Amino acid sequence: LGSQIADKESRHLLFIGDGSLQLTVQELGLAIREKINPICFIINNMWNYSKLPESFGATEDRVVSKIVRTENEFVSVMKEAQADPNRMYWIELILAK
């Protein structure tokens, strides 16, 4: 988030595990307030993080929430996210095996 604020011109892509995100998740508040637009991928594997932005008061005009399970879904959401520089993306990846 800090880095993203440091350079608005560089689109940040975050890859964090659900376990770790829990430790600092509260900064989701700041993300919403500061209207910054990173692409956050939260890899699964204990709470239901998908609907976290909504809890922190974000609307679909601010944060877009996704769940990805397949390859097609992944490709689609990646392109969709990169295509939209004006919103933050909150993407839950479910990895196989």
Ligand X SMILES: Cc1ncc(C[n+]2csc(CCOP(=O)(O)OP(=O)(O)O)c2C)c(N)n1
Residues 6 or more apart whose Cβ sits within 8 Å of residue 24: none
- Asked whether residue 19 is marked as a ligand-binding residue, the answer is yes
In the window 22-81, what residues touch its own copies (CB under 8 A)?
Answer: 22-26, 29-30, 32-33, 46-48, 51-52, 54-57
- Measured from the CB atom, the residue of 83 and 95 that comes closer to ligand X is 95
The residue from 1, 25, 36, 43 that contacts ligand X (CB under 6 A) is 43
User: In sequence order, what are the residues at sequence separation of 6 or more whose Cβ sits closer than 8 angstroms to the Cβ of residue 84?
Assistant: 64
Dump the DSSP string for 13-29.
EEEEEHHHHHHHGGGHH
Q: How many helices (H) and strands (E) are present in the chain, helices listed first?
A: 5, 4
Q: Is 7 one of the annotated binding-site residues?
A: no
Could you list the residues that contact its own copies (CB under 8 A)?
Answer: 22-26, 29-30, 32-33, 46-48, 51-52, 54-57, 83, 85-86
Could you list the residues that contact ligand X (CB under 6 A)?
Answer: 17-20, 43, 45
